[PDB]
Structure formats: structure tokens, C-alpha cells
Structure 1
Amino acid sequence: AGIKVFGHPASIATRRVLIALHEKNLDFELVHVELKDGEHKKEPFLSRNPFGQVPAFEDGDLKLFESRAITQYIAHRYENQGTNLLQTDSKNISQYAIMAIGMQVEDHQFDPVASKLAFEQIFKSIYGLTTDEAVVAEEEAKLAKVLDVYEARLKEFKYLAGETFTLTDLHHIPAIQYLLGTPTKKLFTERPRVNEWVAEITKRPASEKVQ
């Protein structure tokens, strides 16, 4: 009954879902999955996601996993409450496609790089493992290319899909929150439109709630 998120409050992909829920002012329960104990690779969590990755999700009888499938469900199902996470005219197909390009680009070009950066520089550090400086340099060079594209794009429009905040922007927030606490920060601050964009999306109340 109601909306439940099965995840961990430090997980990037879990935070994606949490931010979208807060943006919609939805009530929900966060059910804690203990990653340190391998609970995500055990039953019963495996029956909610056989790939053993947080988050999983429930809205009544509907059971989901994959953060970006979940956010998009939220954005459609609860379109008319709270922040609109779709384009202003959500019935405009070409505008939806432009948002979709940006979502694909986050998923394929931004996230794997940002993830590796956060893993090397933050998560390894929590367990006393040493950061591989070569992976960091290689991954920062990649991220700089992605951010150069974003810079050009943000010269044209206030946000990545157009003039309003959407899922394209939202999906970047958790990884960015973590990378702002690392030397990777410079890559965002040295690009002026990227920097303003980061400042706006991270100061949103929904973003600050999960931080």
C-alpha cells in the first residue's frame, strides 16, 4: 500500500528516485537495504530485482526497478502534482525526444564516468583502499569532454532539455552532489554555465532533502 522505495540513502541511483518523489511532494516509505551486509544480493531483495541493484520500488501493486524507469513512471503517473519533471508541453513529441536524448546522454556518457570517479575518490576511501590515480585522470578527461558539450548546450538554454528543469537535469544530481566533495569539483566550477546549472539544481529543496 502506497509508495515504497527499497534502497539505501547513500546510493546514487536510490537518491535519483528520492529526489523525484520529493519534487512531486509524494508521501513514501524508504525501506532500508543493508548493502554492507550484502542484503541486495540475497532473498528477498532479489525477488524485487534479480540483478541485485538498489533501488527497487512499489506503487500499490506495481513493482519496479531501474532508477530511470522509476523516475519516469513518477513523472507521468503524478504529472500534475508538484514540480513538472516533463517538458512544459508534455504532449509535444519532438520536445519529449529532446529530453530523451539528454537522458540517454546522462546514462551513457555521464553516469559511468561520474560513478567511477565517485568510487575511486570517495567509496574506496571509506574502506581504507587507495585511489587509482590513473583511472581518475583517464575518467576526468572523459568527464571534461561531456561537460564541454553541456557548456555549449547551456549557452542556448537554461537547462539541458530546454527552458525548464526536467528529468534530464534531475538524473545528474546525486552523482554531482558526491563529486562536489572531491577534487573533480574543478571540472564543474571552471565551466561558467555548467557551474550556474550545478548551483541551481543542487540548491533545490528536493536535492537538499537527500543530501
Structure 2
Amino acid sequence: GIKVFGHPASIATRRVLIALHEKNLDFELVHVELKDGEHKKEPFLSRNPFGQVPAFEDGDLKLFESRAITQYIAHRYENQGTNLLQTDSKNISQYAIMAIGMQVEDHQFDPVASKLAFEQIFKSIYGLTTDEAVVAEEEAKLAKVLDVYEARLKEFKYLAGETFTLTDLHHIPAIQYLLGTPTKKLFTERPRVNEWVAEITKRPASEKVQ
């Protein structure tokens, strides 16, 4: 079967889950206890030597790294449920556009969004003090990336074209967390970005992981 070895609150794990719900696939979430340092010990290390979640299995195929996993799903199960690739998934040029988008959330958006969620959400649970200077700084970085999405979105319905793809999907887990933080202003204040966010988070697959 298809099993995801991960933790339900992690952004990366959620990214896989949504791809799975989008394709309407049956899978099993095998819970890895981050809290007891499970991700840092055998046998988990055997699934991912870099000791991070998620890890994944489709029958005899074993994968780790969430971007790689979602790409595998979009292709292996292409014609099942929602196609997560470009409408013309044969066109290398169209595909190049989406691959830049995936590359961009990875380098520009994600490290920023993750630091911001760590600061305002993870810390909260354990009563740790949020660094106000870090959060103002990271928000400076985010707005910057968001001004880019804003201009892009003034010409295309979604980031990679007129269709929802892996590029948009990849941004859901982190945005869902930031929307319940005062960082939501950066999304709400930019018209085209706000609407884009409304669309991707209102999807039922997106809703299935919160």
C-alpha cells in the first residue's frame, strides 16, 4: 500500500497528504514521534538517513523528501483525481515554468514561512518567547516574495499558469499556519495574493489536513 511515515503537524508531511487527497488515493499515515526523537533513530534512519519526515512508500518503492514525493504522485497517478501537473503536461516549456515555481517556493518562500511559524506557533506550545526582531525581519522577506507573486498573479490565475499545480499546492501547509498568525496581513493586504490564498486553502483536500 501507500504509507506516509511522518508527523501530522509538520508542513512537509502535510504537503504529501494534500497531494494524496487531491488524487483521492488511499494511504496509511504511519506516525513518527518527533517528540521522542524517533526521527533520529533506527529504524527510521533506514528510511531517511538525514533523519527528517516525511518518508514514503508505494509498494516496494521507498522515497523521502516531500517535493520528490509529490512529483512522483502527480506522475504515477496522473489520471487519477485532480491532475497536479500542467494541463499540457507533455510540453517541456510549460513544465519548465512550473519547475521554476517549485524551485521558487523552495528557495524564497519556504525558509521564510517556516521560521515565521516556528517563532509564532511552535514556541507558543512550550511557552518559549517569540523573538519580535526575528519575526519583523522575516516578514520583511515575505512581503518582498509576496510582491513578486502579486505581479505574477495579476496575469495568471495560479502561479504556474491558468491551472492549480504542484507549485500552488506546495505553498498550502505553511500558508494555512500563517493565516492563524498576525502574518496574515501580508496576504490580506495584497489583493491578487489574498484571492489566490482563498482558492488554495478553500480546497477540500487542503482542508483535510488541518
TM-score normalised by length of structure 1:
0.99
| C-alpha deviation, 1:50, in angstroms | 0.6
Q: Summarize the alignment of residues 190-209 of structure 1 with structure 2, pairs less than 5 Å apart.
A: 190-209=189-208
Q: Which residue of 2 aligns with 1:52?
A: 51
**Separation in 2 of the partners of 1:127 and 1:69?**
32
CA distance in 1, matches of 2:133, 2:96: 36
**Distance in 2 between residues matched to 1:120 and 1:16, nearest whole Å:** 20
Question: How many angstroms apart in 1 are the aligned matches of 2:179 and 2:16?
Answer: 20
Task: Give distance in 2, aligned partners of 1:150 and 1:78.
Answer: 29
* Mapped partners of 1:112, 1:51: distance in 2: 18
TM-fit CA distance, 1:167: 0.2
Deviations 1:4-46 (A, max 9, x none): 0000111000000000000000000000001111100111111
User: How far off is 1:80 after superposition?
Assistant: 0.5
- Secondary structure in structure 2 of the residue aligned to 1:79: coil
What displacement does 1:135 show? 0.8
Deviation, 1:123, is: 0.2
- The Cα shift of 1:98 comes to 0.2
> How large is the RMSD of aligned CA atoms in angstroms?
0.4
Distance (whole Å) between structure 1 residues aligned to residue 23 and residue 111 of structure 2:
27
Give me the whole-angstrom Cα distance separating, in 1, the residues matched to 2:85 and 2:191.
Answer: 26
Distance in 2, matches of 1:3 and 1:113, equals: 31
How far apart, CA to CA, are the structure 1 residues paired with 2:161 and 2:201? 18
1:104 Cα deviation (Å)? 0.4
Q: CA deviation at 1:75?
A: 0.3
Which 4+ runs in 1 deviate beyond 6 A?
Answer: none
Q: Deviations over 1:147-199 (max 9, x none)?
A: 00000000000000000000000000000000001000000000000000000
Aligned residues: 210
1:210 aligns to what SS in structure 2?
Answer: coil
Q: Please give the TM-score of this superposition, normalised by the length of structure 2.
A: 0.99
Structure 1: runs of 5 or more not aligned: none
CA distance in 1 between counterparts of 2:160 and 2:83 reads 13
1:125 corresponds to which residue?
Answer: 124
Give me the whole-angstrom Cα distance separating, in 2, the residues matched to 1:43 and 1:124: 28
Q: Secondary structure at the match of 2:4?
A: strand
